[PDB]
Write a protein that binds this ligand. Structure first.
Ligand SMILES: [Cl-]
Ligand SMILES: [Cl-]
Ligand code: NI
Ligand code: NI
Ligand code: NI
Ligand code: NI
Lengths: 381, 381
């Protein structure tokens, strides 16, 4: 077919960068983060929608691998929050070990330049994101260390309210959008060069974040509200604010978010959602955010990671121009990460002050007086 | 003086690399990790033995900055252990922010090559270590992420027993040296390229670690037992095993470890301890591990970080040859870090399997059967 060869050519010209895949949590469920002597299984998995053979087959250019851990359910809230931080480092560790053990397929990337150099070499550009601010355990210091470990976006919530923002699927509302801490964290996320992700957050939390953010944000895996009304989808109001923010909505393959009856969902619905957003706010603000391995079953035509060439061919079939299809594939999400890094370099270059944690006093006034007296003795030598 | 100009020349030829300084914990005590608009104080501190002006004055070539947090004292042991992990990321964060905010003085280094390139530029080579395995919260995954954040040595204990090894100052003994987990961790530390530190560990834990380790280890801040008997000092038995291991004992300035009466301690005692070790196991296995800012007061002649030229001049005065003085200053600790990296590259290059954590089952057998059934449906398409 001439349309299939056009899709294959496009997939080789520019990287298709997917916004969210929970394959690291499947490794946690199945192998319990023990991948020693499991290459045969990692290439041909007995479960799920992702493995290293099907990842090659679908011609995927890049991937934001999710380092998700569940919302804490412990009665002791201190332990649950701290347990989420330890589990986050376990998931970041298995993502790094997965990339390092398969250097012919996967290559780590943390920037626009590293995505391209990975794509030139024929590798899947492997980026990292965390799915919820419950993962940092109220520590902005920890968040900066997660950035240093290679995390490049942060979903503000999952399916639970935290100290910073409101989740979409939980009622009643706690903060009514962002908290006062959340507003300060937006500045710190812009300063450090962390990409803001607004999937799983409430409509009011999106509206506030889009007006307050100085860098462009993403929806790593969310769909359109007008076509299918759901708390997880993006309203026409927030789509307009995403345009002004210069962000990208990466369309989700979740069957619940594409249609009212889940088993009726298809590839055509995903294309309808991409075209809706591309028509109304332009094709430079739409992306692909599968959420593969965050679901049991996918839509008809997008059952696993090998099906990306069908999506690219489907968009070209509807009359979306090559330049616009390339934008939806990856050029848009590259631009946002590029602009997030430029905004961070500007704010750091202008010596903007970082956000410090609420740290307890460790020394009493007796200890401080001994130390000051001791310093003045050294001055008198 | 001709001996002072000889010391100054040596300090410019090769970097004096100190094994342990707790200036990051002083920033935690004094500023509470909030150094915004505190440059004047960071250059001229009202407390302690370290600041950025005196650091320049002493002509220090490199420094292993301690990311120490105290042993957990909570009745709930789970919270205390997890709290230590969060505090570790806070201390690593303030060390990184300290280095980045003063790029003319400090430059981050994580290898032998990065130490030299930092020293060519006229910067203090800023490395990182953690003072105790209580800091990782029983997570080997976390430890690998600490390595990725720039930690290059790990003290096995502080003043508390942990799941891996016995501390020196605590009785009764728990494991009697290393635990069965501790023995496995030695292999993993050698594999990842993490330098083992045996300061604060019991005599039996040292003996076992020195025989079991495949890479050379250090004592980041410990002194000689024969000259002054203390649980924290190194015995003649362990000094001999350090020679076979090819490690380095970095001599401590703690007044308790140099003499029986603390106020009698001096620079001459530190030189006696260096010469003792250098005479018996050779000068290629001795270093300098001040422990500045881990004490209120230092010895007479080594009151703060500006006093390193007096130590170099003092060694030359006793008749230690220039080549041997250069070894004690930094060449030895560079070699160990170089050999730790070569051993790691060999073991990783020979595909040695990494140590995985005891992770809980998250999915029940019902969830796994749904996933396998779902996979076979996709296979039949
Ligand atoms: Cl699932
Ligand atoms: Cl103190
Ligand atoms: Ni997810
Ligand atoms: Ni999700
Ligand atoms: Ni210390
Ligand atoms: Ni110490």
């Amino acid at each position: 077919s001439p349309i299939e060869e056009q899709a294959t050519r496009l997939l080789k010209e520019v990287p298709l960068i997917d916004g969210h895949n929970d394959f690291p949590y499947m490794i946690r469920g199945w192998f319990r983060n023990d991948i020693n002597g499991q290459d045969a299984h990692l290439y041909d998995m007995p479960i799920g929608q992702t493995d290293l053979q099907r990842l090659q087959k679908g011609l995927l250019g890049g991937q934001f691998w999710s380092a998700f851990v569940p919302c804490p359910k412990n009665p002791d809230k201190e332990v649950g929050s701290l347990e989420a931080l330890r589990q986050t480092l376990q998931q970041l560790d298995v993502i790094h070990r997965l990339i390092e053990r398969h250097p012919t397929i996967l290559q780590f990337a943390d920037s626009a330049a590293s995505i391209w150099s990975s794509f030139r070499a024929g590798r899947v550009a492997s980026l990292i994101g965390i799915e919820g601010l419950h993962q940092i355990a109220d520590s902005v210091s920890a968040l900066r260390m997660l950035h240093r470990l290679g995390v490049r976006y942060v979903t503000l919530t999952h399916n639970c309210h935290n100290a910073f923002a409101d989740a979409a699927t939980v009622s009643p509302e706690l903060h009514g959008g962002l908290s006062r801490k959340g507003e300060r964290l937006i500045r710190e996320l812009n300063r450090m060069g962390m990409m803001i992700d607004l999937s799983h957050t409430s409509h009011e939390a999106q509206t506030q974040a889009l007006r307050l953010s100085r860098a462009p944000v993403i929806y790593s895996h969310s769909s359109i509200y007008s076509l299918r009304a759901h708390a997880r989808n993006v309203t026409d109001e927030n789509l307009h604010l995403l345009h002004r923010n210069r962000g990208v909505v990466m369309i989700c393959f979740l069957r619940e978010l594409l249609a009212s009856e889940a088993d009726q969902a298809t590839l055509a619905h995903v294309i309808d959602h991409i075209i809706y957003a591309g028509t109304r706010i332009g094709y430079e603000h739409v992306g692909i955010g599968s959420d593969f391995d965050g679901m049991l079953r996918g839509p008809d035509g997008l059952h696993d990671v090998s099906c990306y060439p069908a999506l690219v061919a489907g968009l070209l079939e509807r009359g979306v121009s090559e330049e616009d299809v390339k934008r939806v594939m990856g050029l848009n999400v590259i631009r946002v990460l590029e602009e997030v890094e430029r905004v961070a370099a500007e704010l750091q270059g202008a010596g903007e002050e970082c956000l410090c944690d609420e740290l307890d006093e460790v020394w009493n006034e007796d200890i401080k007086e001994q130390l000051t007296r001791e310093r003045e003795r050294v001055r008198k030598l």
